[PDB]
């Protein structure tokens, strides 16, 4: 769909990151509050039925 809406940072310093497994869109959607900055109008998927 079209995007719902459309500076510096110190966390993002790549020399500080431990990259083991690349974070994919499935992960960012499964855990939308942990892998996501600025989640607005996000519904929380989970099921283990």
């Amino acid at each position: 769909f079209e995007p719902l809406v459309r500076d510096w940072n110190e966390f993002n310093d790549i020399n500080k990151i431990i990259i083991r497994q690349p974070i994919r869109t499935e992960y960012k959607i499964a855990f939308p509050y942990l892998y996501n900055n600025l989640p607005h109008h996000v519904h929380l998927t989970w099921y283990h039925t």
Binding site: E2, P3, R24, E26
Partner: protein
């Protein structure tokens, strides 16, 4: 999987917006140790002696011969 690629809408690009992956992608330690080895031997000898005779002369006699034997 949309991983930060392609237009958020392929509207105003003049393309279809297809994305494929890049297919062409790829001796003081020695001295210390020696002293302790005799020291451990000294403690074991002294206790062994007291258990097999705590008559202090008995302990000193067994420990002294043991310490001398070890040092030699």
């Amino acid at each position: 999987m949309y991983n930060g690629i392609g237009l958020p809408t392929p509207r105003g690009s003049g393309t279809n917006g297809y994305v494929q992956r890049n297919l062409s992608l790829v001796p003081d330690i020695l001295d210390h140790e020696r002293k302790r080895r005799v020291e451990l031997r000294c403690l074991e000898l002294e206790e062994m002696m007291e258990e097999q005779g705590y008559e202090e002369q008995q302990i000193q006699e067994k420990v002294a011969t043991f310490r001398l034997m070890l040092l030699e």
